[PDB]
Amino acid sequence: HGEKSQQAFLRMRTLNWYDVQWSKTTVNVNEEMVLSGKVHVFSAWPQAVANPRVSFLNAGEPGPVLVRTAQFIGEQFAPRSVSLEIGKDYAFSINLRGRRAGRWHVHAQINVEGGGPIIGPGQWIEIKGDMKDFTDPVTLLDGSTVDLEHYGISRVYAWHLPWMAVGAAWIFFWFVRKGIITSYIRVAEGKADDVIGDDDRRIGAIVLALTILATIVGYAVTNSTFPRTIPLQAGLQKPLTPIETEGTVGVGKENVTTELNGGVYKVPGRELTINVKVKNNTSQPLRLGEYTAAGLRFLNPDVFTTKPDFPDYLLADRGLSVDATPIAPGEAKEIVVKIQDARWDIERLSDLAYDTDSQIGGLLFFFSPDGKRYASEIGGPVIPKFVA
Amino acid sequence: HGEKSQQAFLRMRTLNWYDVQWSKTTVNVNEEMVLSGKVHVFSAWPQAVANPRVSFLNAGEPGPVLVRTAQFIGEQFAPRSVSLEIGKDYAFSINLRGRRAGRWHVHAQINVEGGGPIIGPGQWIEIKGDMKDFTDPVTLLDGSTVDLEHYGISRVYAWHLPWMAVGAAWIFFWFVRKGIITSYIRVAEGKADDVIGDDDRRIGAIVLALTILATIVGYAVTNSTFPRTIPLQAGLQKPLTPIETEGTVGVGKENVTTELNGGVYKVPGRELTINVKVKNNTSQPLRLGEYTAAGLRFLNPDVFTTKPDFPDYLLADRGLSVDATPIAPGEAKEIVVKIQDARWDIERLSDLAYDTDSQIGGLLFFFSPDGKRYASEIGGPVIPKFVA
Amino acid sequence: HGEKSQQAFLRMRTLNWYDVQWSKTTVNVNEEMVLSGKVHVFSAWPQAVANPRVSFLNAGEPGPVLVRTAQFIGEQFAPRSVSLEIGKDYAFSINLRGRRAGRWHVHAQINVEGGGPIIGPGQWIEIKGDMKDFTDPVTLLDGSTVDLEHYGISRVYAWHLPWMAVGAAWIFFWFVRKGIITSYIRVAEGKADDVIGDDDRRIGAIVLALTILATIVGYAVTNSTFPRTIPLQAGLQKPLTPIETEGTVGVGKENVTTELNGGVYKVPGRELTINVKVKNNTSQPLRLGEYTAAGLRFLNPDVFTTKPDFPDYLLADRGLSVDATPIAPGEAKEIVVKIQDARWDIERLSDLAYDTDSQIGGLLFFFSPDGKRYASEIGGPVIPKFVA
Amino acid sequence: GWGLLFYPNNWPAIAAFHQATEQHGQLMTLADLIGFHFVRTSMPEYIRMVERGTLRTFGKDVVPVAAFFSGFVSMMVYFLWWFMGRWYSTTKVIDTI
Numbered sequence A, B, C: 001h002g003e004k005s006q007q008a009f010l011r012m013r014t015l016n017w018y019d020v021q022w023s024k025t026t027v028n029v030n031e032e033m034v035l036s037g038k039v040h041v042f043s044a045w046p047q048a049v050a051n052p053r054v055s056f057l058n059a060g061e062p063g064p065v066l067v068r069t070a071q072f073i074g075e076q077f078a079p080r081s082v083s084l085e086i087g088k089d090y091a092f093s094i095n096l097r098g099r100r101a102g103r104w105h106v107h108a109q110i111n112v113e114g115g116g117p118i119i120g121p122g123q124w125i126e127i128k129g130d131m132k133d134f135t136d137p138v139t140l141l142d143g144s145t146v147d148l149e150h151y152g153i154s155r156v157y158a159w160h161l162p163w164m165a166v167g168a169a170w171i172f173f174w175f176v177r178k179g180i181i182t183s184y185i186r187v188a189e190g191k192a193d194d195v196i197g198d199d200d201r202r203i204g205a206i207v208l209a210l211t212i213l214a215t216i217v218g219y220a221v222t223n224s225t226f227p228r229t230i231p232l233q234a235g236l237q238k239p240l241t242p243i244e245t246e247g248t249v250g251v252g253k254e255n256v257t258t259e260l261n262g263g264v265y266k267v268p269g270r271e272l273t274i275n276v277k278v279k280n281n282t283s284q285p286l287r288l289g290e291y292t293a294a295g296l297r298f299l300n301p302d303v304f305t306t307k308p309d310f311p312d313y314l315l316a317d318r319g320l321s322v323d324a325t326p327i328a329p330g331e332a333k334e335i336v337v338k339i340q341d342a343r344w345d346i347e348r349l350s351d352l353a354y355d356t357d358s359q360i361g362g363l364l365f366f367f368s369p370d371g372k373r374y375a376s377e378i379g380g381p382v383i384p385k386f387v388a
Numbered sequence D: 001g002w003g004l005l006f007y008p009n010n011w012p013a014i015a016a017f018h019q020a021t022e023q024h025g026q027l028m029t030l031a032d033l034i035g036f037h038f039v040r041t042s043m044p045e046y047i048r049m050v051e052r053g054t055l056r057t058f059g060k061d062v063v064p065v066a067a068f069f070s071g072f073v074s075m076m077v078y079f080l081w082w083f084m085g086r087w088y089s090t091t092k093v094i095d096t097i
């Protein structure tokens, strides 16, 4: 929810989210919803952000309002850190479960080890029900089923609270047997021996023996229960399998290849007149229909006749100026694209002038006469236009 | 010899040794034996172990009982560190020479810079003869031949021992000329000037001049001898050339591709019921015949009719359950493999439950009706079966 | 100009410069000259030098005698750090501009992040004119044109010098109002209160208020001017595009592949009898014509009938002994190459014996009956021949 | 002088092992050959932490540069350890421990 404050050029040149979907907008407690999508790793990964070689898939939400039951990326179950190769596209899906009643903004998020959090598109999720009705539940290896919402808390209390009580009792015993001022005066008057001296040391040794006995007894008792335990499972996972369809820029014999030749963004404003050299390379007449910068879906009004079902704060149905002319096939030509929408300034992408690298990035989507979609990665320097 | 204590999942998911051979089991002093083999670098290299980008080939033996005259890996003479690329197969060979009489367990070993030692198969070598009969020998650039067993030791003694004697003489001279208690009392009584004062400083300066003269004379004399010397030769070697036959998983147009779909290892026990999805991809009917985990050759009794020549502690002729059905060609099917042998528990691979990553690895070997062998890399999570 | 002192094996096994040209040898003040060339990144990059993953293209000259107006590498404008992939060839060009009259030795230089400077070929540039006639000039985003030789210096002086004067005035005021000896004696005599006490503190607070007012006024005034500024633009650039013609070792279906099988360099001397296994692989009868080690163009007298235009200190027209026999096509044979020239010793490449890795590197150039040139990378261990 | 005298006084004992030998078409010192021949288990080559070359070493002065460097870094260490030896020579007796 804080992606607005992140730097623009880092947001648009690290991960390019697309095809992000939320299974349900309104969910009940203990009801499952699936957040899925695809992410493209920018080829020109910034030096500021470390390599995505170590990264973690996460659900961006205000706390555990939705419990994550399972998540997959690269066709792999990914509860641990995964590796993202630069220039590849990956498909992810997170199985969430309603826990807390309210209206929450749930994002798709990937964290890079040396970079930090990268926040994708977010959607408002309405959760109905009561917190006390929430149960996970999970099954153990032995076959027993437990409820992770409440399991183990009673044992933790029963082991921790008595020891805190014992410590408090020890402190109060020594405080009432010997006063603070009284013992201080006694020690200062040279006689710091009648303040503590056996039978006092006997009481201390009795307490220590009882404590050691309880620790050994407690350790042995909690070994009879749970006799077979395993260490924490950790470590980077095996390499993921990227997407291969169709494309999915960089894959297949048919693909569009775009190259930025200069751009102008009005500061302050909302325009982005970018000159794109499109080689089309494919077989069916292709027309630009969408530009996802940092998730912001700037859709070309002509191609995208029907506005799709995407979070309004990112869905801009005004990615104007393509050429109104199918460019494919085989032709390499330069087209002028005029991105203009208030969302470009709302999402602080217009703050690219404040960044130390005035460079844009994202994905260009071209569409056939039919529904076939071809993705192309666009990125490069742009020049700010300082207006009054 | 200490590979048993190393963690199981690291042993089976870093290097997969195969085709390891020892030229001779019984060798004499000054007699040459060759330890050769092939090693496969696991594709899913663990995060715990650093990259094999910097690694060293070594012979695992209890000290220099066998002198290494030459060693090669990747078709390169490798006296220095070499680079191993993840997923490749390399052929190595070490030319050993008998030095110490006895029965020694000699392993093949590769050390990774940030990981540590990886120990391969080991064989008992019987060495007959006497230590005093051992000569290397090596030849210099000028053509002279020296014996590295004894060369240079006399000069080192003749330079080191006299200087130690000189230091002892200096200490004893100053100790007898001025006593310890006597000089301490003298210094404490204010007169710390008649304890040391010229002619004492004259003796000191004479000693220093003689020492400097000897150092200069010694340096010049040892420059007349050995007038042409070179600095220590160090540095990582050029990239190695992997194996390309036939395969050698990952090479060639004909190869088996296996994928683990769950496994069960009895703890405590010796079983490993692993479900393997075999795609065979090749042209000749292929039947699973061998599974090398950490060098442990679990051979399928049917295919491996004759038990091969391999260290008994690793050679398990009971890699049971394949399908008793040739799977190739073109067919992708799921087979159930039941690895079961006491060596699985002896070599302490059953301790996979103690590890922080319950994941297996290794190589699967498939054989044609003829002797052609196809290698496939298997690896993935497995689930412990807690027996009472 | 200090490349002679750098270690030989690092010089010849990091970057192999070729096709280096200087547009003009004699240039005037405010006149543009272009230094261009191609560089090959050695496949066996030394461990001592860090990866060329972060590197910077630079012009090696004694200070800003020539102002760099623009520089390109990998078909990219490169004012910032760039990435060089090991084994690739890159084309670079630097647009210089005469600034200081004299005769200067201008090199082509690339700096590696963890390695340091790598110095390429250098040529003497004669610059005529006067320093005071030098103007850059550059144009701003608003369209105004400024002269970088003098722009901004007046403002820096007008802001810095008055504050230094103010500090000096403050010091002298407090030094004359209260003497050093006088105030020291006063403080030591217990009365360190009549040395500093209001009205003194009033003068101090007046000075502080005026200073804060000037800082705020100065900050606001310099915000009215230059109301639109941007932060420093920094960061590694996008990956470069290597050369693909023709080859350009490692590219194309037609290429020579050479492998060193031992070498002998006379120490001290100038010879390098290297045994090269040439596979020719190409289609036209190829004959060795050039060996660029560290830029030193050792040209074979036969093939190179006309001595080319290249700095004499590197151009050696005596790269003798190829075989006087066209080797291509399809034939793999071993040829003996006898590099011998005084430049090999002048450039301290004969000091390879002093290095910790007696290994050579560089590029081998083969030529067709016509002018087509095929490049091959040669490198490997060589053995010094100690002569009297 | 404690630093400048280290290499010269050690040269007589290590020069014989710096003689060049040819091993399988590769130059190796006698010391390198000795280390390579007599196998040490937990001692690979990559850990040797020796002079492996560098782009701003200016040849024929590596040993003089290193010897001088150890020469004056010793002065700091000599000072600190002289005073540490002074402290270890204390006769102080504390009342309670």
Ligand SMILES: CCCCCC(=O)OC[C@H](COP(=O)(O)OCC[N+](C)(C)C)OC(=O)CCCCC
Pocket: B215, B216, B219, D004, D005, D007, D008, D011, D060, D061, D063, D064, D067
């Ligand atoms: C300190 C008095 C005795 C040695 C005098 C001498 O000739 O040695 C100096 C020479 C100076 O080095 P250089 O001749 O430049 O290179 C020789 C390098 N080695 C010794 C490896 C052949 O050798 C050293 O490196 C010893 C350490 C410095 C002492 C001043």
Ligand SMILES: CCCCCC(=O)OC[C@H](COP(=O)(O)OCC[N+](C)(C)C)OC(=O)CCCCC
Pocket: D079, D080, D083, D086
């Ligand atoms: C030439 C520099 C002398 C520095 C020592 C000195 O004057 O005393 C200061 C302090 C207190 O010493 P003090 O109790 O006065 O005893 C005087 C006897 N010595 C001179 C041996 C410390 O001594 C130290 O503990 C050593 C500080 C430097 C190395 C980190």
Ligand SMILES: CCCCCCCCCC
Pocket: D060, D061, D064, D065
């Ligand atoms: C004082 C003479 C210097 C001789 C050449 C440089 C040797 C290295 C000394 C630091």
Ligand SMILES: CCCCCCCCCC
Pocket: D084, D087, D088, D090, D092
């Ligand atoms: C290891 C040195 C620690 C300090 C020794 C005691 C210092 C005594 C101060 C008078």
Ligand SMILES: [Cu+2]
Pocket: A001, A002, A105, A106, A107, A122
């Ligand atoms: Cu949000």
Ligand SMILES: [Cu+2]
Pocket: B001, B002, B105, B106, B107, B122
């Ligand atoms: Cu052993």
Ligand SMILES: [Cu+2]
Pocket: C001, C002, C105, C106, C107, C122
């Ligand atoms: Cu120069």
